[PDB]
Amino acid sequence: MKVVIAGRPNAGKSSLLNALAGREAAIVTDIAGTTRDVLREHIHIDGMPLHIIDTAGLREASDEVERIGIERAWQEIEQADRVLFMVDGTTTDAVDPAEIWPEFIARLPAKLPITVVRNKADITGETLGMSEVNGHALIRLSARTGEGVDVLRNHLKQSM
Amino acid sequence: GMKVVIAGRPNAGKSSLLNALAGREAAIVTDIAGTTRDVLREHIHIDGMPLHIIDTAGLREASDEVERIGIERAWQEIEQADRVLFMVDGTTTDAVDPAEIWPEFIARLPAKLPITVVRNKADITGETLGMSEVNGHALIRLSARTGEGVDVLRNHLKQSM
Ligand SMILES: Nc1nc2c(ncn2[C@@H]2O[C@H](COP(=O)(O)OP(=O)(O)O)[C@@H](O)[C@H]2O)c(=O)[nH]1
Ligand SMILES: Nc1nc2c(ncn2[C@@H]2O[C@H](COP(=O)(O)OP(=O)(O)O)[C@@H](O)[C@H]2O)c(=O)[nH]1
Ligand code: ALF
Ligand code: ALF
Ligand SMILES: [Mg+2]
Ligand SMILES: [Mg+2]
Ligand SMILES: [Rb+]
Ligand SMILES: [Rb+]
């Protein structure tokens, strides 16, 4: 199954791709617009194989390559079986994704299931782990420190 | 199966080749040098023979930090290749010997690593497509943009590996 990592620039999408991959598969920097190309990694949880797909942070970009990467990111979303909507927790205390970015949520294919991932729990102090908002799955992790990425691994097995 | 790494200077047509081999638009291609930075890996098959194709950032002295980093990762894939396709923009030089095109690059490769010199953009130079040899290296003239000469590459990849 195709699981697409998507959200704003600098949310930590590539860190999570790397954590899920177990491998420095995507470049990771604090410069917004680091990922432009779509990056795919084939993994296996527990007998369940999936493609995890890292994408350019969504925005209106004047960098042409990034502009193209954002086109393709939306195209990956269109074909996704699940989106992991990645949020930098330090930027908002909001947990309902309609409060975080309604425009993005509203644009997503109807009934494409969304897992909301409040990342950088290491700066927030947020309590780690899974819950649910407005019927959307909600995982609090650190992609950088691996802290709580395990629950997400199990979540994917369960839900897919 | 084995790992084929596409390497060379920026804008040589390495992503264009990856997409022609993969039969789909895996890598972003533009006229802008420094488009590719992350390493892109595609798994393909030729005549049933499985093959890994790795696209890399063009090697240059880059001002952009993400690109500098992709260049490092590009080298770290090269070190680990079973073959390198050394892609050269044909309209930039009439040279065929990789030693005349970029000696530094050629010398830094691991001792055992074979290389196929690919002279890309043959649609512009008008050079005859197909296979030859320079100084013991395999040599191929093709257009990744049009796909002309790429079957010769595919056949060379199956025979060579
Ligand atoms: N402190 C902390 N930083 C993170 C975490 N995840 C990502 N980052 C950092 O935030 C910046 C952007 O990360 P990256 O994965 O490349 O973001 P992307 O643009 O969404 O893919 C980098 O400096 C990362 O090291 C996290 O869980 N905790
Ligand atoms: N005329 C011609 N143009 C090409 C060919 N291959 C690539 N290009 C163009 O050269 C530019 C750089 O190509 P790209 O594949 O992104 O280069 P890379 O930086 O080495 O990956 C783009 O404008 C391509 O369309 C070719 O065989 N013929
Ligand atoms: F801002 Al990014 F990958 F570098 F979304
Ligand atoms: F210049 Al490139 F991939 F964009 F080597
Ligand atoms: Mg990224
Ligand atoms: Mg390229
Ligand atoms: Rb980034
Ligand atoms: Rb390019």
The residue whose C-alpha atom lies closest to atom 28 belonging to ligand 1 is: A120
Q: What element of type H or E holds B159? A: helix B150-160
| Structural tokens at position A97 | 């994704």
Three-state SS at B130 = strand
Nearest CA in chain A to B34: A65
Q: Domains of chain B: which residue ranges?
A: 1-161
- CB-based contact (8 Å) between A149 and chain B? no
Give dist(CA A102, CA A144) in Å, integer: 26
**CB B42 within 8 Å of CB B55:** yes
Give dist(CA B155, CA B59) in Å, integer: 27
Sign of CA dihedral A95, A100, A102, A104: negative
Residue with tokens 């899974």: A130
Closest ligand 2 atom to residue B28 Cα is 16
- CATH class, B1-161 region: alpha beta
| Structural tokens at position A67 | 């502009």
Q: Which residue among B30, B38, B73 sits closest to A64, beta carbon to beta carbon? A: B30
Q: Which long-range contacts (CB under 8 A, 24 or more apart) does A144-153 make?
A: A144/A12, A144/A15, A144/A120, A146/A19, A147/A121, A147/A122, A148/A121, A149/A16, A149/A19, A149/A20, A152/A20, A152/A84, A152/A115, A152/A117, A153/A20, A153/A45
Residues 6 or more apart in contact with residue B125 via CB below 8 angstroms: B90, B91, B119, B141
CA of B48, closest CA in chain A: separation in Å?
A: 21
Sign of CA dihedral B123, B125, B126, B129: negative
Q: What element of type H or E holds A74? A: helix A64-79
Q: Resolution for this model in angstroms, one decimal place?
A: 2.0
CB neighbour class for A129 (10 Å; exposed up to 12, middle 13-18, buried from 19): middle
CATH fold for the domain made of A1-160: Rossmann fold (3.40.50)
φ, ψ at B81 (rounded to 5°): -70, 155
Three-state SS at B161 = coil
Does the CB atom of residue A32 touch ligand 3 within 6 A?
A: yes
Cβ contacts from A onto B, under 8 A: 39
User: What experimental approach yielded this model?
Assistant: X-ray
φ, ψ at A18 (rounded to 5°): -65, -40
**CB A155 within 8 Å of CB A135:** no
Neighbour tally for B65: CB within 10 Å: 14
Nearest CA in chain A to B32: A65
* A41 Rama class: left (phi>0) / alpha (psi -120 to 50) / beta: beta
Q: Of B47, B42, B39, B52, whose CA–CA distance to B1 is shortest?
A: B52
* Helices A149-159 and A13-21, axial angle in degrees (round to 10): 80
Give dist(CA B130, CA B148) in Å, integer: 9
Give dist(CA A130, CA A156) in Å, integer: 12
Give dist(CA A139, CA A133) in Å, integer: 10
